Design an enzyme around this catalytic site. Structure first.
Site, PDB file in Angstrom:
ATOM      1  N   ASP A 128     -18.078 -20.500  -0.172  1.00  0.00           N
ATOM      2  CA  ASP A 128     -19.283 -20.708   0.387  1.00  0.00           C
ATOM      3  C   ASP A 128     -20.397 -20.580  -0.596  1.00  0.00           C
ATOM      4  O   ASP A 128     -21.535 -21.028  -0.587  1.00  0.00           O
ATOM      5  CB  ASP A 128     -19.741 -19.613   1.426  1.00  0.00           C
ATOM      6  CG  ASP A 128     -18.520 -19.479   2.623  1.00  0.00           C
ATOM      7  OD1 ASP A 128     -18.132 -20.564   3.298  1.00  0.00           O
ATOM      8  OD2 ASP A 128     -18.194 -18.491   2.872  1.00  0.00           O
ATOM      9  N   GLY A 164     -30.978 -37.085  -6.761  1.00  0.00           N
ATOM     10  CA  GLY A 164     -29.611 -37.291  -6.080  1.00  0.00           C
ATOM     11  C   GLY A 164     -28.233 -36.999  -7.087  1.00  0.00           C
ATOM     12  O   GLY A 164     -27.196 -37.448  -6.976  1.00  0.00           O
ATOM     13  N   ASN A 185     -26.756 -30.083  -7.787  1.00  0.00           N
ATOM     14  CA  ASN A 185     -25.944 -29.336  -6.453  1.00  0.00           C
ATOM     15  C   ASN A 185     -26.761 -29.230  -5.280  1.00  0.00           C
ATOM     16  O   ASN A 185     -26.281 -28.599  -4.523  1.00  0.00           O
ATOM     17  CB  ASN A 185     -25.010 -28.377  -7.080  1.00  0.00           C
ATOM     18  CG  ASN A 185     -25.894 -27.208  -8.134  1.00  0.00           C
ATOM     19  OD1 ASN A 185     -26.269 -26.067  -8.015  1.00  0.00           O
ATOM     20  ND2 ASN A 185     -26.738 -27.791  -8.990  1.00  0.00           N
ATOM     21  N   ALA A 212     -31.288 -35.289  -2.609  1.00  0.00           N
ATOM     22  CA  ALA A 212     -32.315 -34.752  -1.786  1.00  0.00           C
ATOM     23  C   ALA A 212     -33.647 -34.993  -2.412  1.00  0.00           C
ATOM     24  O   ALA A 212     -33.823 -35.848  -3.191  1.00  0.00           O
ATOM     25  CB  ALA A 212     -32.324 -33.039  -2.368  1.00  0.00           C
TER      26      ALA A 212
END
Ligand SMILES: [Au+]
Lengths: 282, 281
Positions: free
Chosen positions: A129, A17, A20, A24
């Site tokens: 992005d 957790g 980046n 997850a």
């Protein structure tokens, strides 16, 4: 975080957790033994258009030096997004561990960096992005560079911000990216960020000042080829119009040295089927 | 605080100045005659150059094992004595665990083997316990990393053995066994035993669980029965009953895939220099 699914395919390695890869789930594919990350977005109103966007957008990315989408799954509760996981940690950490890189190691990673950025640009993914300020490494005994795209703890220096981005509301994201890559190269070679005063990193005004006036200074004890020094001088250009471009770098002598020449998932249909099925919450 | 200035600029290439971590505040530099990368610590000439420093450096110089962070050389400056040693450029073993989530039982065995080899060796040299920084082992730069233990220095209470908390007299070697168990666990589970992961700063609760040896291998972590046994044999509150290093050296889990493998600076120069740097310009 929603419980463990498809025991037949994936083993729960560890819930994480704080990277980046976000919050997850870390899982092994019981066939490839491949390590993978799994994000989650509750089923319901969240399963929107910009998500679907990101998912499709992402899947398009196929270059190895990128954190690639793998698959999408449906749970009663959530949308689980499964992707590659870079188990080698941050490139920055490796730098700090090294003190600094040799020009050849710096070149080795920088080649991969440009390859992946070039590819991403050629699929129109600029700038914000791309997490080019925190690139990562796979697990291999010989480390591959891995760039995160779309994230749907870690300190980020303002040094990564190109001057025009500081000065302006509109700019070319691709050129900005070039600047960014310059920062990464520098840090690899010097072991410290440019522009940022190492002894007052939280003196942001000072940092920004040096960015705007492109005030950097390769340490006397750091010794790099004149080609390398040149490339750096060509990236750290305040005027985006005059900054070296990606293709230009692709043909630069330093870049070309020892350059390796190399540089069955889901139907988009069924992907859309699961996204749909997922937009409604039991 | 701040270091003295680059020296011996003909044997060594300055790599970097660093201000914290595990090698403390130090200097990274490169020996041009081996290519090898090294770290340098600095103590101020005079009074600080005490008997513990003498003993520490001597003892350090004595050790030659591939799993131990090795003494290179000592050097005099106007302001400081320079101690040069091996530098583990692979970072902390813990960081590699976190990066992995957790290790496979085979990878955990691979590192644990090296761990025991080095601890065993250090014990044979009468270097126990507080001489070893067993809570923060490191890796070399090898693509296939070698474990590197810091001996002599110049966190989590998980590593502390129940007897070290409770008893007045204890054996440091046995305590060390406990420590190694902690490291094994964390490799396999990806978290410390005893420590509540949601309450890591709850040292009370932690300590409680240490004293009562309350640990629980997660359901989703699956390890051989041999492995589980070994762990049960280390996590014993009574030091008298805890498995010993040699016992481990003969344990079935330990022996699996075990590799069989498991020009210094003159003592005079060294002692001479430690003596000379007793006087402060
Ligand atoms: Au308690």
């Amino acid at each position: 975080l929603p419980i463990m699914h498809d025991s037949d395919r994936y083993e729960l390695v560890k819930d994480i957790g704080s990277g980046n890869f976000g919050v997850a789930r870390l899982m092994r594919d019981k066939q490839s033994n491949e390590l993978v990350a799994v994000k989650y977005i509750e089923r319901g109103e969240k399963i929107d258009e910009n998500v679907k966007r990101e998912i499709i957008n992402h899947r398009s990315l196929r270059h190895p030096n990128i954190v690639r989408f793998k698959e999408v799954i449906l749970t009663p509760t959530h949308l689980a997004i499964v992707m590659e996981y870079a188990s080698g940690g941050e490139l920055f950490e490796r730098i700090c561990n090294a003190g600094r890189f040799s020009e050849d190691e710096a070149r080795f990673f920088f080649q991969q960096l440009i390859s992946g950025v070039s590819y991403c640009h050629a699929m129109q993914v600029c700038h914000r992005d791309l997490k080019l300020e925190n690139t990562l490494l796979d697990g291999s005994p010989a480390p591959r560079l891995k760039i995160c795209a779309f994230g749907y703890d870690t300190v980020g220096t303002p040094a990564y911000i190109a001057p025009e981005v500081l000065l302006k509301k509109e700019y070319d994201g691709k050129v900005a990216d070039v600047w960014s890559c310059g920062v990464t190269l520098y840090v690899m070679l010097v072991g410290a960020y440019p522009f940022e005063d190492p002894e007052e990193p939280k003196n942001f005004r000072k940092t920004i000042h040096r960015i705007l006036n492109v005030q950097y200074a390769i340490p006397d004890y750091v010794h790099i080829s004149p080609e390398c020094r040149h490339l750096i001088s060509r990236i750290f250009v305040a005027d985006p119009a005059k900054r070296i471009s990606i293709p230009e770098i692709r043909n630069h002598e330093w870049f070309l040295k020892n350059l390796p020449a190399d540089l069955p998932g889901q139907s988009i249909e069924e992907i859309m089927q699961i996204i749909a099925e997922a937009t409604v919450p039991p």
